[PDB]
Amino acid sequence: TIICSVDIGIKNPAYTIFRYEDSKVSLIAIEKSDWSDNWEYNVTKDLTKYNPDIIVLEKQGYRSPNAKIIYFIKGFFYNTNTSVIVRNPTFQGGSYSDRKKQSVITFMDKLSKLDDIADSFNLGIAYIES
Amino acid sequence: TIICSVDIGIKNPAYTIFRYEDSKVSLIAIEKSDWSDNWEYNVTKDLTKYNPDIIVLEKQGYRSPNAKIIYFIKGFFYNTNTSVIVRNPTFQGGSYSDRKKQSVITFMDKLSKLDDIADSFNLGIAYIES
Numbered sequence: 001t002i003i004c005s006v007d008i009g010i011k012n013p014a015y016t017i018f019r020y021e022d023s024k025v026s027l028i029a030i031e032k033s034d035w036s037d038n039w040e041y042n043v044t045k046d047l048t049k050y051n052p053d054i055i056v057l058e059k060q061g062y063r064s065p066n067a068k069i070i071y072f073i074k075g076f077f078y079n080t081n082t083s084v085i086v087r088n089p090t091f092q093g094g095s096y097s098d099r100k101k102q103s104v105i106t107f108m109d110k111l112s113k114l115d116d117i118a119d120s121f122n123l124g125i126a127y128i129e130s
Numbered sequence: 131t132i133i134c135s136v137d138i139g140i141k142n143p144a145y146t147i148f149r150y151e152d153s154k155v156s157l158i159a160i161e162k163s164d165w166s167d168n169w170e171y172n173v174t175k176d177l178t179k180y181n182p183d184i185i186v187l188e189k190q191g192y193r194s195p196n197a198k199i200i201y202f203i204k205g206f207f208y209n210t211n212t213s214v215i216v217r218n219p220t221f222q223g224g225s226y227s228d229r230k231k232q233s234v235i236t237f238m239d240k241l242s243k244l245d246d247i248a249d250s251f252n253l254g255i256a257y258i259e260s
């Protein structure tokens with residue numbers, strides 16, 4: 001099963017591709033992108049590039065400029081082999097920059113503008129552990 | 131070509147189906163629905179029911195929680211033989227009451243609570259003037 005956990009953003013989107021076979025997780029790819037222009041074309045292209053079995057997203061809120069993107073993805077993959085799972089922020093508390101720092105920290109510690117890739121990565125891990 | 135102009139709503143979604151052959155428009159159906167529960171399920175079921183070639187919707191306004199339905203539809207019909215057009219409100223200006231009232235009135239004359247079906251009706255007609 002191929003997991004595509006993405007950290008939704010307009011100009012700063014990012015997603016990490018994992019492979020989960022036999023309780024053995026493996027980082028297949030990591031990529032930054034740009035959905036500031038022609039988001040619809042790029043959103044489908046980027047998320048279908050690796051044919052994920054599961055796409056993980058973070059809850060956005062109707063007042064967010066990212067909300068349109070989360071609902072497009074749900075509709076696009078609705079009734080297909082890919083299942084879209086939406087979660088809550090991996091990190092919560094302190095200030096905005098506080099969560100963005102421990103996210104990047106946790107990220108580089110696990111490998112062995114980074115906050116977008118860090119988030120996407122950490123989001124997949126938080127999901128996989130379930 | 132089958133055109134499905136929809137008047138998005140949670141409890142009062144309505145949509146009219148127009149056939150358009152030889153520069154001759156004709157009513158095929160007019161339906162009220164309910165998207166209070168499992169809107170994803172009902173939205174897809176209702177809009178594909180009459181196999182439209184085009185879906186016409188109207189902008190829901192900045193930071194509107196019902197925009198989720200608009201993007202879900204764009205994403206669902208993305209890259210299929212179904213075009214999704216989003217138009218601006220058909221009746222603008224004045225009070226909400228007058229806009230609904232002008233829709234119902236206008237809808238009653240051309241046809242030869244009713245604001246949802248009329249709104250959806252007038253939306254299709256407006257799109258056709260294109």
Ligand SMILES: [Mg+2]
Nearest residue numbers: 007009115116
């Ligand atoms: Mg980000």
Ligand SMILES: [Mg+2]
Nearest residue numbers: 137139142246
């Ligand atoms: Mg209505």
